[PDB]
Design a protein around this ligand. Structure first.
Ligand SMILES: CCCCCCCCCCCCC/C=C\[C@H](O)[C@H](N)CO
Ligand SMILES: [Cl-]
Ligand SMILES: [Cl-]
Ligand SMILES: [Cl-]
Ligand SMILES: [Cl-]
Ligand SMILES: [K+]
Ligand SMILES: [K+]
Ligand code: NA
Ligand code: NA
Lengths: 287, 245, 245, 40, 245
């Protein structure tokens, strides 16, 4: 009272089940009005439509817009991991495997997710398992989810497999593929495929520049698997993991990856061979 | 009446007689964090005019062969004025920005800069050329400070993505024959309500000459580009001693 | 708001950012022939969009010494697109026109073209110089086709009449320091409701440089002039086989 | 009905038996109005 | 709509397409002397259109080194047209003025003239340099006629006063990149209702180049300055024979 100085979004949602119609138009001849002329410098895309540039007929368009809803674009199971437990070799003659959950190892799904900066969703995981040649044998397996901070099994018979609190699934290689629903688990409000920053404070000496881009809010822990038995199993095992996004929301679209992927954790690209987004031709005046 | 404009905030005012409108990123004005979204319980400090004002950074020179530059936010201001001081003394920070990029020439010069804001601008390396080396960008490249940095491969934005599609982000163009500045208002974007102004850069500002500068010899050849930015609705929390990084 | 304009007809659109209004010849818009005036009894064909659209003819080059050009209507289009085809297959034709002449230069060039429409533009010969020879213009001169022709004596419009008075006809000027185009809308004018598109040219379009083109050497010297025309309310009757002349 | 797309002179005569009259006028000093300037 | 203007008075009209508004000195329009203020008893003559019209005086040439000029009122017109004749035949005179100073260049020239009206512009001499000589200006300097005179020391307006403060008087600037004329309307100012047009000059018009003319060689170098003035509400009294001084 005795000190006076101490006293939004202009756009929203519409439902568009079908493509816009075309209204019939005729010739327009005059000064002042000029819809064909634009100013791309503004940052806006052109507002001109067919009826302003030509004479149109009427078209009652019933083409649906439903299949391009992000939900239908993403809710299709895709491969996010291939885990192997061979019986001979340097791989894992141990009968168990601990896999750090990182889904950025396969391009098809990755490129689709990276179209957005942030995504929030639930997921359906399907586990397709078989011998490396595709054959199936009566082998009992156990898949266990080990959240960050939970003891990781150190052997085929580590106490951790008691799985008294962690969720585990027991299934036979002969049963259909196991399948479960997973909720949204980040401590953040959304998973983020791009984090322009460092996870901790400190000097960022070239020794720990591998910290750059690592967002802890996306680190979901470990996925462990073993043949259920005190003795070694005679079978090599191939586990393919598929993920299906559901109940999804996405924010901030970005340019799509146009260089092959090199690493799971960063956007590094092969500098000696930078691919052009479009194929080439000889002359700009010839097809 | 759309080409003329004035921006006044704090003890600072910008004028322009050759604008091309103003962009409001994703259609949203910056705003202080609301109680429903907040999580940190301490009452924040909202300095107002001492930090929500225009700061002008170092100027760059546009040459017929420039590749393009970029700056990270809030990195650019972590060590400038009262804003920087608040960013250092607090763990938590949050704000929006008004970005005003300036560049004037003459009716006889030509060229076009694309001015864009790219949220979570994560950079990549050329992987030792062959692609067998998993190298990473050094602090100085990811957080260049107020001087900004230079793009080595603008075509892929030093991140394996096409410049051709950057217009999918909030942007404007400075086309010398049309305007002499770009203005973009950016709201806070993040997966958390507040964050560290030191460890995380919310977005990057890119200024790339897509249509190269040109002019007949005899015409002024020093054509600078100047960046002036203003935090909006700056809020801070988690007070303690000052930390630079 | 009088200097800017857009013309859209058929599947074609013209734009101009330096116009000088639009002329409607004798104050009348073209219109289809009404039943009171008509005489031919067959139901005509009115193709609409396939013929009432903009056609761009061959471009001419304006030189410091050009005399001026002219085109005859409907001759120019008798062999172009669907319009020409209809003109050939029918004995009777009738239509109006939208004439748009284009010519842009720079703020450093100068000159002025007079763009006019002269109904029943009958040409004459210089009569063997002495005037004792009763010579006549050859087909190629009276009906030059889409390429148009050149005036040999613009001062008397190759017809014994003063160019100085041509402004008594529907016209506009293209004065380089002011505009870069001329637009004239012409209604059907004749003593009969319909006529042959082959034997009779309703009017002629003249483009004469009354104030010669000039510019300092070093400036662009190729200054073209382009003619784009659109039939309006084209109607045809008396169908039979195609005839070219 | 099922196909929508299937659905003059701004000057006229006056009688002027006599030449126009001349109305008395005074000085006009101002911006904006400029009758002497034309665009032929 | 503030840059364009027309001034019509008497049988004369001025046009300008690059004005910068119009000044009404001290906010008052000229007016004939009212009966309360008047003192002379004879009915005055108010010639109207024969004297309240625009007169154009001799033109001056602006050079990169010009010092500036000045004219005295009503001296400039005492021998021009019907106004001068009335000023000579009458003892008493009174009027206001519309002053229009013209100067156009090109978008490539530069410079700025200060155009001002200074009531009772009394001139001084440089006092023999040392200041020991009490010299005075000769008639030709105090009343230069229609040709006007040149300032020898513009900085002190040849009168011991600072040019820097002349803007405290009714004025406008002709800044070549902005406008090409100045217009000032001046009301009668004096300690008496009427006065001699010969013995007393009510005010002086100064045109001083405060920002010197400049341009690259090759550009037109003859940049004239023209003064056109119009008496307003001219009234005269005390008729007798003609007197020139
Ligand atoms: C018993 C079956 C357990 C199955 C548990 C699977 C949990 C996986 C949750 C999906 C988390 C989304 C992926 C998150 C982050 C990305 O991988 C990051 N790029 C890693 O840095
Ligand atoms: Cl067990
Ligand atoms: Cl590049
Ligand atoms: Cl001739
Ligand atoms: Cl001086
Ligand atoms: K629809
Ligand atoms: K009359
Ligand atoms: Na438009
Ligand atoms: Na006018």
């Amino acid at each position: 009272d005795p000190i006076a100085d101490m006293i939004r979004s202009l756009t929203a949602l519409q439902v568009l089940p079908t493509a816009a119609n075309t209204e019939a138009s005729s010739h327009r001849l005059g000064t002042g009005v000029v819809p064909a002329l634009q100013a791309a410098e503004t940052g806006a895309s052109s507002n001109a439509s067919d009826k302003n540039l030509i004479e149109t007929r009427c078209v009652l368009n019933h083409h649906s817009t439903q299949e391009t809803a992000i939900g239908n674009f993403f809710s299709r199971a895709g491969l996010v991991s291939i885990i192997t437990m061979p019986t001979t070799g340097t791989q894992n003659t141990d009968g168990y495997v601990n896999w750090d959950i990182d889904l950025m190892g396969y391009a098809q799904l990755r490129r689709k997710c990276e179209l957005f900066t942030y995504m929030r969703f639930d997921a359906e995981f399907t586990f397709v398992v078989a011998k490396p040649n595709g054959e199936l044998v009566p082998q009992l397996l156990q898949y266990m989810y080990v959240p960050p901070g939970a003891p990781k099994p150190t052997s085929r018979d580590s106490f951790a497999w008691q799985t008294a609190t962690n969720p585990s699934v027991f299934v036979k290689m002969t049963d259909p593929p196991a399948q479960v629903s997973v909720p949204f688990m980040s401590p953040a409000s959304a998973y983020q495929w791009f984090y322009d920053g460092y996870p901790t404070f400190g000097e960022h000496l070239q020794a720990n520049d591998l910290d750059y881009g690592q967002c802890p809010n996306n680190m979901m822990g470990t996925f462990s698997i073993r043949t259920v038995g005190i003795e070694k199993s005679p079978h090599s095992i191939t586990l393919r993991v598929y993920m299906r996004i559901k109940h999804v929301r996405a924010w901030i679209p970005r340019p799509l990856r146009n260089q092959p992927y090199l690493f799971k954790t960063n956007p590094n690209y092969k500098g000696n061979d930078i691919k052009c987004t479009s194929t080439s031709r000889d002359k700009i005046t010839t097809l | 009446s759309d080409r003329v404009a004035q921006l006044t905030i704090g003890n600072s005012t910008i004028t322009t007689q050759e604008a091309a409108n103003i962009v409001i990123a994703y259609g949203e004005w910056p705003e202080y964090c609301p109680d429903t979204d907040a999580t940190a319980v301490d009452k924040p400090t909202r300095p107002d005019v001492s930090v929500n004002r225009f700061f002008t950074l170092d100027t760059k020179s546009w040459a017929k062969d420039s590749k393009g530059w970029y700056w990270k936010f809030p990195d650019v201001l972590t060590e400038v004025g009262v804003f920087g001081q608040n960013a250092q003394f607090h763990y938590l920070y949050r704000s929006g920005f008004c970005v005003h990029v300036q560049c004037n020439a003459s009716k006889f010069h030509q060229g076009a800069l694309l001015v864009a804001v790219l949220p979570e601008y994560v950079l990549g390396t050329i992987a030792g050329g062959t692609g067998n080396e998993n190298s990473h960008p050094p602090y100085a490249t990811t957080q260049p400070g107020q001087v900004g940095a230079v793009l080595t491969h603008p075509y892929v934005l030093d991140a394996g993505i096409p410049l051709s599609q950057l217009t999918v982000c909030p942007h404007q163009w400075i086309n010398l024959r049309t305007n002499n500045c770009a203005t973009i208002i950016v709201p806070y974007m993040n997966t958390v309500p507040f964050d560290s102004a030191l460890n995380h850069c919310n977005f990057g500002l890119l200024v790339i000459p897509v249509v190269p500068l040109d002019f007949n010899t005899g015409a002024t050849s020093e054509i600078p580009i100047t960046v002036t930015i203003a935090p909006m609705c700056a809020e801070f929390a988690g007070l303690r001693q000052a930390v630079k990084q």
